[PDB]
Amino acid sequence: MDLKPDWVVGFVDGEGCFYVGVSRNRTMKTGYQVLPEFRIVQHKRDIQVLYALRKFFGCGVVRKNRYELRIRKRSCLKKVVEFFEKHPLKTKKNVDFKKFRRILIMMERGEHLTKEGLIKILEIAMEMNTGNHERLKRTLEEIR
Amino acid sequence: MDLKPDWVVGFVDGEGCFYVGVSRNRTMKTGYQVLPEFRIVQHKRDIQVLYALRKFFGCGVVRKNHDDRYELRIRKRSCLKKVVEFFEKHPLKTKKNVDFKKFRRILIMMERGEHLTKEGLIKILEIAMEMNTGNHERLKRTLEEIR
């Protein structure tokens, strides 16, 4: 499988998901962990595409949920982010992408380690289309 | 917005559906009309993409689907022909290509008028049933009516 960058942009506009989860994790000073992730889900008949996309980005995990390319490692997410800056998404995923990127930058620069940075991140995540709004709302309430 | 061909391929690989329906139609000697179509469904916030694809192909209708969803639907023979020739030039990468190839075979058959004959229509229904679309039991009932 050989994939052309604009083919990848099209496929991700269609199938890709930029997500930021937050879970309780009382090890963290703040009490919470932010979990950004990028995911593309395909039926098993198309698992080849998932491996081809892993090869394209040079990183990621292909796993069964229905199989998934899931990217969690910040180094790998960085490559994803710089790909989509050079080759922008076309749908509303572009807007989720930009919030996703902003959170990733904040985390790389360690801003999530303060109460105020965590709060800022939660607010940005609540503006994304990818679920968990009520859940983000409830953790904002616990932090305050 | 303007789209690049490779982007269209990528997007259709992900979200495209090649559909072959059938309905009764008394004006046909065979008693039925095959209705191939290409559809792409999106949430309403991405309505703009549907109009971009419509502009890219230069044909098709954007319409409500259900609830908060909308569709680009391409049905007219002259438009389907433009879709077929596009994906001949720029092949799909996923197993959407298998559906596409079955879809193209059917349209080629329908251009040749094969749907006007019993055996030609039967063959079309049989190919449609090998496709990954949610219409099998309807195709099956139609074959039973025919026989």
UniProtKB/TrEMBL annotation, chain B:
Signal peptide: none annotated. The keyword Acetylation does not apply. Disulfide bonds join 59-79. This is Putative homing endonuclease. The lineage of its organism: Bacteria, Thermotogati, Thermotogota, Thermotogae, Thermotogales. InterPro entries: Homing_endonucl, LAGLIDADG_dom, LAGLIDADG_Endonuclease. Residues 9-106 form the Homing endonuclease LAGLIDADG domain. It holds the Pfam family LAGLIDADG_1. It comes from Thermotoga neapolitana. It comes from the Bacteria. Gene3D superfamilies: Homing endonucleases (3.10.28.10). Keywords: Endonuclease, Hydrolase, Nuclease. The gene is i-Tna1931b. One of its GO terms (molecular function) is endonuclease activity. PANTHER family: INTRON-ENCODED ENDONUCLEASE AI3-RELATED, LAGLIDADG ENDONUCLEASE.
